[PDB]
Design a protein around this ligand. Structure first.
Ligand SMILES: Nc1ncnc2c1ncn2[C@@H]1O[C@H](CO)[C@@H](O)[C@H]1O
Length: 574
């Protein structure tokens, strides 16, 4: 419990170092792998461990007379390293090791001068995200370290620390008056979804291979509705919000719509917070929620609600027909979509409604892929309750004995074939831009042995203006078309940050913990894959050649955005 607090700070602190490094120090060149002149204030124990140094000295010149020292376990062009000491800072001066709060005060404080822009909210958010993490750790701190990985839902609920490179991972600014512990996957949160009785004339249903009626069936047991009516459901938090609107009030006071209880299915919220998982239900429920959670506000905007539909119909046309050109793609359907809005409301309203009431079903792929056989990547490669990459002990148990270097490179290599081949085939063959970061990705495994890397999330999916866009069957609202349209370098920036800096960087960092020498080998294995896959592509790919030949990699900046998205340029690992 004090231990708990201290684990949460080390995670939240390392998370923040990751932003600082990747988003400022490496791109703006404030980083040096060198010992300081004076060590006064840094205790031997911080950098010497009896035998040898605790790794490599890392130094940042934060351009305001402030200096930062930290022992890292490796040199890394992406910033992906393990921090093997506390953090120390200077002025004059003498090195010091301030508590977590003043340590955040101060790092942040410097980040602001480097970015010219300040965010007082972000600060209070950082401590919030950290405080939750304590509670989280504290609640789960007695479990087998790797239990998260044993089971799909549990891996959706063992992402104890959130975004590895994010200043406020667990911060969820909804009305504090609605709690926090009861809407957290990480507290094993469960809840019967909030429902509403609405008349069938306002329904907007998008289905693919599914009857309008079957979509409804998916979201809510349609029975309790009187005829001419239907049952939508929402996040219970969304439900309070959505009921705040003068508009809805009116609707309620006029019995145009009935507010049923939290009376829907009992589901568990997923790591994405507003998606819900019912075991052996054919679908997840991906509802909206007007709350900032990490970056954005998790509404399905009205146009996004149309586009899921098209993307699904797209992904099937392709999977059905263009198999070979997809490098092995496995994707979760988003086959059905529902929203409601008063029959006669005029579109500033109609829209507003459909985005409050928006719902999207995702195929519960655990049915195709087996509960105990599929693990959410972000968790696959996360640090468990002891700040130890869970992947290690998971594999050690699946492969009987401890795994030598070459086992680990093999493993890594089966993995990354199956993440790279589909993402990149999708991009260059079709202009379909995916968002394959750690959370948008689920590993399917035959007892350790990677089978598929399932991808999902059509919100994230965009289409390139020269290519991807062409699968758009043109009678599409100009606003919808606008949400899908990525410029091809806009788009390649995403694919780059996602596969490389968010996903594999981290996959690597997880496996090579304790064995940094594995890092560079792994990336070299990456680079061959890059070339072999290219050899296979059926369209040109200059940006790929660029990358293979070691040109710099795009990296989305989480912290800088919140302070002043912006992508910065990080040196290739090769
Ligand atoms: N490594 C990650 N990258 C992107 N999103 C993540 C990551 N880990 C967790 N998430 C969660 O996934 C959602 C982003 O789609 C957010 O709710 C975010 O908090």
């Amino acid at each position: 419990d004090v231990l708990s607090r201290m684990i949460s700070e080390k995670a939240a602190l390392h998370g923040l170092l990751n932003c600082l490094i990747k988003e400022f120090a490496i791109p703006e060149g404030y980083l040096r792998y060198e010992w300081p002149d004076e060590m006064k204030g840094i205790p031997p124990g911080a950098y010497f461990d009896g035998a040898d140094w605790k790794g490599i000295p890392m130094m940042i010149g934060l351009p305001d007379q402030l200096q930062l020292f930290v022992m890292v376990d490796r040199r890394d062009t992406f910033g992906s390293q393990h921090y093997l000491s506390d953090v120390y800072l200077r002025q004059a001066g003498d090195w010091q090791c301030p508590d977590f709060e003043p340590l955040v005060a101060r790092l942040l404080a410097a980040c602001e001068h480097i970015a010219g822009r300040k965010n007082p909210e972000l600060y209070e958010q950082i401590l919030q995200s950290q405080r939750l993490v304590s509670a989280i750790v504290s609640h789960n701190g007695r479990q087998r370290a790797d239990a998260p990985l044993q089971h799909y839902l549990q891996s959706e609920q063992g992402l104890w620390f959130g975004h590895p490179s994010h200043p406020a991972p667990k911060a969820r600014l909804w009305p504090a008056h609605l709690g926090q512990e009861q809407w957290a996957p990480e507290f094993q949160a469960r809840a019967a979804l909030h429902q509403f009785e609405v008349p069938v004339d306002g329904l907007h249903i998008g289905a693919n291979g599914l009857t309008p009626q079957q979509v409804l069936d998916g979201f809510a047991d349609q029975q309790p509705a009187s005829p001419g009516h239907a049952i939508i459901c929402m996040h219970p938090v969304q439900a309070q919000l959505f009921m705040q609107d003068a508009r809805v009030q009116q609707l309620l006071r006029d019995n145009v719509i009935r507010d049923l209880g939290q009376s829907g299915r009992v589901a568990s919220p997923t790591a994405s917070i507003r998606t819900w998982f019912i075991d052996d239900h054919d679908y997840f429920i991906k509802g909206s929620l007007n709350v900032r959670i990490t970056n954005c506000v998790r509404k399905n905007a009205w146009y996004e609600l149309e586009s899921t539909v098209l993307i699904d119909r797209l992904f099937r046309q392709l999977l059905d027909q263009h198999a070979d050109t997809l490098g092995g793609l496995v994707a979760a359907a988003e086959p059905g979509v529902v929203s409601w809005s008063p029959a006669a409301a005029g579109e500033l309203d109609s829209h507003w409604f459909r985005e409050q009431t928006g719902g999207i079903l995702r195929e519960n792929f655990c049915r195709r892929t087996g509960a105990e056989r599929s693990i959410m990547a972000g968790t696959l490669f996360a640090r468990g309750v002891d700040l130890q990459p869970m992947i290690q002990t998971f594999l050690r148990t699946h492969y009987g004995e401890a795994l030598d270097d070459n086992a680990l490179l093999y493993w890594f290599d089966d993995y990354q074939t199956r993440l790279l081949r589909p993402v990149l085939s999708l991009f260059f063959n079709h202009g379909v831009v995916m968002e394959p970061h750690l959370q948008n990705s689920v590993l399917v495994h035959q007892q350790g042995r990677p089978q598929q890397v399932l991808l999902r999330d059509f919100e994230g999916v965009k289409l390139t203006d020269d290519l991807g866009i062409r699968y758009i069957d043109d009678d599409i609202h100009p606003r919808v078309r606008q949400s899908l349209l990525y410029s091809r370098e806009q788009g390649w920036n995403r694919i780059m940050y996602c596969l490389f800096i968010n996903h594999l960087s981290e996959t690597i960092l997880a496996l090579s913990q304790g064995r940094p020498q594995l890092a560079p080998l792994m990336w070299r294995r990456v680079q061959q894959q890059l070339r072999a896959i290219q050899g296979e592509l059926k369209q040109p790919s200059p940006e790929l050649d660029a990358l293979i030949a070691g040109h710099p990699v795009a990296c989305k900046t989480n912290l800088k955005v919140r302070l002043a998205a912006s992508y910065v340029r990080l040196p290739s690992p090769w």
